[PDB]
Design a protein around this ligand. Structure first.
Ligand code: O7U
Ligand code: O7U
Ligand code: FE2
Ligand code: FE2
Lengths: 411, 412
């Protein structure tokens, strides 16, 4: 299958992409726009990109908002309370059905790579079982990573450490955590040592809900970063949220950046989720509550954006479209400069793939998997400004989604 | 023409809308889904609402971002510096063309009512001349109000007061202002006195850029509110932005609310614009910088959302789609509660129309103009969650825009 007349990011001319046997066989510069071909994917001057990535979402909780009651306060903590209520009735079939619907939404919006957290503070591990199976079942749509996430804490939820260990044994490929939710600071710290030991022993990736709170003394990030540095695991480690960094003392934060850079770890920020859940304990002025995304990027550190929630105990909206999240992030993090906008798709493609350690299984280069999208825009700026639609999604060299180009009529 | 199988906001029934002679002749609930004849539009169970309103935009500046330089700091004040540079080459025709193009975007997204600010701190008044004619040229698409906006101030700019006066004599519908940007506090106050006198004398509406700054001591709102109250001009007055309220002392702000309620004035908030321009002088933590929208609304005060800019010296993005701003607004103002969502369209339809004093020329009611949209959603919640597309736009009883429902194909 050929893709003709395509633009490639931050370049100017058109290219033909020749896909053969599931991989990218050839990429070739065109003299010019070429004759409209119905046998080919004719991008008609539109951008070809590798698939969007959703590096942080909760598929076990998705589509449960309001059951049995609503998060009336809009806080992280009542959200956990409400989720505990809903978790009481969870089963693998319930998990599989809701997860597949939401995977459908992600698919509709060009997402082919997904990292889901799953609560393993549940003696039955029902959702984990379901999502381990969904990874295989949904493989024709997405590559799913699964994070063992101890929602109610490692150190104070009953048999917390044993559930984490069992979850990893069962096949979760990423180790999670929630140090700011442990009952005491010292247990926050011990939880990090435990989970890094667990990850290192099994050669697992790491993705921790880290300092998701507006308390400037929530400093578990330094503990995770240092463990990553000492153990040489930085490329395999991700700190999600780090909302508290958005409130840190600036002298401390400047010092911290040296360790952050040296550790080599990745950062994920969930701007729609945080704008909603953070700032709730201020009156006025009311803080944004989002981590220092622009500053991390400028320091040469890998950072990216995620939706986090789709219609769940924490967040009432959501439709699968990562571009909306990109829009929110660039606004809230003050990244609307000319230069930011010309490369802003990094934060939902390349950077996210890096955090997921996708390697040569991602990107538009010869010999790599034939997974790509045709986007209805010529560049990053227009992609975000217009919230460009995904016209074609190709996976393993096969078209799995096609959208007609919109045309408005003016009678 | 007839529209059947139409949902209405916050109701369960399906309705038929009978449109004739430019007005809404009848609205009647149906028993169930019905089949459409010839000359009958099937809303297919979709929501029907009055048009979207853009109650605050800068059409004179639209589509000039980057010319001649970029706003590197992303601040209000640098934006003003860049605008002054661009102002040196502004002409009536280049203004017309850019305004018209952005009006097209607004139209594409179902906006049929627009209030534009126009910088009148310009001896040529070239953009004002242009937009007065655009109000006429574009009337087949929108009803445009024009605000006499003194960007570089009333008391500060050469012949500021004369320039406002000329603008009103030429027929600006609304008197604007910018008290926080005047050179001293005392001149911010006097500027409000002048603008209120001007509006009251010429019988015009008022819409002031009020306290667009993160200084907790920018309190020109109280002055504006009190004048509106004393002069009995509440309904005809709007305070735009009021970003400083998002930083006010809480005891002062509680007291202030008594006056805001008593004044009857309206409020406009621009969440995408202020999330961009505000918080720029904090380190960490960084304030949101938006006015107290959920609070004003809870107090029974009318507040609404607006885009403010489209690709201009103050904001490099923008596409005409008010639903994106609604989404932004609901997040930043912590208005994502179940109840908020069930009525969230208020903030870009009804509440906006009230700020613009549209009265009986707006709203889905028998006798009023046949201006309406069919959205690709069944309720407020889905409208905002799905960023629902405008499938049909109808103006004066005639279809002015038609979109086909999106159909995604799964070939594999
Ligand atoms: N806001 P979020 O990422 C969603 C679920 N559970 C959490 O602890 N945090
Ligand atoms: N941000 P904005 O509403 C746009 C232009 N001029 C202003 O004073 N304020
Ligand atoms: Fe999360
Ligand atoms: Fe404005």
């Amino acid at each position: 299958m050929k893709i003709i007349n395509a633009r490639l990011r931050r370049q100017e001319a058109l290219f033909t992409l020749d896909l053969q046997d599931g991989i990218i066989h050839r990429i070739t510069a065109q003299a010019a726009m070429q004759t409209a071909d119905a046998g080919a994917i004719d991008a008609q001057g539109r951008l070809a990109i590798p698939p969007f990535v959703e590096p942080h979402i909760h598929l076990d909780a998705t589509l449960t908002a309001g059951e049995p009651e609503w998060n009336r306060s809009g806080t992280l903590f009542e959200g956990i309370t409400r989720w505990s209520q809903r978790k009481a009735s969870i089963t693998p079939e319930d998990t599989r059905q809701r997860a597949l619907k939401t995977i459908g939404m992600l698919r509709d919006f060009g997402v082919q790579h997904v990292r889901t957290h799953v609560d393993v503070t549940d003696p039955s591990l029902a959702a984990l079982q379901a999502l381990l199976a969904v990874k295989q079942e949904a493989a024709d749509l997405i590559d799913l990573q699964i994070v063992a996430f101890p929602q109610e804490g490692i150190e104070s939820y009953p048999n917390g450490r044993e559930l984490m260990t069992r979850a990893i044994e069962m096949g979760a490929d990423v180790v999670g955590g929630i140090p700011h939710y442990e009952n005491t600071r010292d247990k926050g710290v011990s939880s990090v040592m435990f989970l890094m030991d667990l990850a290192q022993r099994y050669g697992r990736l790491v993705d921790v809900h880290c300092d998701e709170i507006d308390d400037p003394q929530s400093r578990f990030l330094e503990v995770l970063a240092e463990e990553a540095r000492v153990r040489g695991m930085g490329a395999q480690v991700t700190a999600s949220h780090t909302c508290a960094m958005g409130s840190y003392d600036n002298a401390y934060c400047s010092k911290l950046f040296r360790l952050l850079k040296a550790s080599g770890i990745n950062f994920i920020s969930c701007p729609t989720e945080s704008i909603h859940l953070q700032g709730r304990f201020d009156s006025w002025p009311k803080r944004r509550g989002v981590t220092r995304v622009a500053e991390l990027d400028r320091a040469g550190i890998n950072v990216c954006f995620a939706q986090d929630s789709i219609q769940d105990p924490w967040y009432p909206l959501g439709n699968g479209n990562i571009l909306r999240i990109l829009d929110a992030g660039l606004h809230i993090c003050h990244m609307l400069g000319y230069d930011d906008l010309q490369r802003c798709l990094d934060f939902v493609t390349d950077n996210s793939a890096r955090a997921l350690c996708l390697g040569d299984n991602y990107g538009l280069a010869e010999g790599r998997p034939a997974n790509l999208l045709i986007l209805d825009a010529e560049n990053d700026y227009e992609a975000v400004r217009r919230q460009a639609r995904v016209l074609t999604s190709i996976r393993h060299g096969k078209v799995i989604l096609q959208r007609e180009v919109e045309h408005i009529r003016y009678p």
